[PDB]
Structure formats: structure tokens, C-alpha cells
Amino acid sequence: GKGKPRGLNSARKLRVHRRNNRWAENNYKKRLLGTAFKSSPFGGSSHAKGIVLEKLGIESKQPNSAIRKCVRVQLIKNGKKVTAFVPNDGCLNFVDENDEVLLAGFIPGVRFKVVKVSGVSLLALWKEKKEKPR
């Protein structure tokens, strides 16, 4: 005896026991209750819109420093202020205050990078294949 019923007519007890025990999994609980997205940085979204507040590293002396590539962005969805990378100091010129930016998952504590600015990709602008519309 392994601590479980084994009779040929014990199917009910196994089924009901399994359903009760299946809720032990955190993964199962999150899937059924639809709470798997709280841990997501964007709350379930693959990207995040925001407002460029300030370019903190503009006063740095060392070019292309880690400080220089950081920008404080205010998420439009909930208003929480967060910090994001720019791919390089060259792209930093494109980004300006009070202009929309699309953020994606990536100095510790910084977890986001800018992928689009004013509805245009930074890489597109950086390769001189586009102009930022204002």
C-alpha cells in the first residue's frame, strides 16, 4: 500500500482527490484565476507606452557612459515613473522631453529599453531610414 486507493472501482476517489490537490500548484492557481500577469513588469502587456520626463545622464562627461543612456519615463497606463535605456548616446539626441516612447523588456534596477519614439523605431531613425514626425 502506497497510501492511495487502488481498487478497480476507486476511480471517483482518485479523481476528486486529484482535483483538490491540483490547486496546490502556484502555476495552476495563477492560470485558472487569471493572476499570472501581476508579476509581469507591464501587467500583461508586451510593451509599454510612456512620457519622456528627463534625460538624467546629459551632464555626464564620459561619452557613451552607462549614466548617459538612461531616461526617466512615466508610464501612461498607471503613471508610475520608471527608467529605461537608449541603445546609444547617438540615439539619445532623437529622444526629447514630452514625447511618446514605446518600452520593452531589457546599472541595476533599470529593466526597460526604448524601441519606438513618436511612433517611429529608434533603430529606423538611427540608420537614417526615417524622420521623427512632430
Binding site: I67, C70, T83, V110
Partner: peptide, 29 residues
């Protein structure tokens, strides 16, 4: 004299810049 003053000015600027940098890195984290 201007040699003495410039070292004083440069010293003041360097200290202020580092103080500003300490603030920025403190705020980000």
C-alpha cells in the same frame, strides 16, 4: 595669481560635479 585662482575655480567645479553625480546615481536606484 590667476594660476592660484584657476585651481580654486577648477577645484570648486570638480567638487560640484561629483556632488551632482552622487545625487543622480542615488536618485536612479
Amino acid at each position: 595669481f590667476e594660476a592660484r585662482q584657476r585651481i580654486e575655480e577648477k577645484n570648486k567645479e570638480s567638487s560640484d560635479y561629483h556632488a551632482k553625480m552622487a545625487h543622480i546615481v542615488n536618485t536612479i536606484n
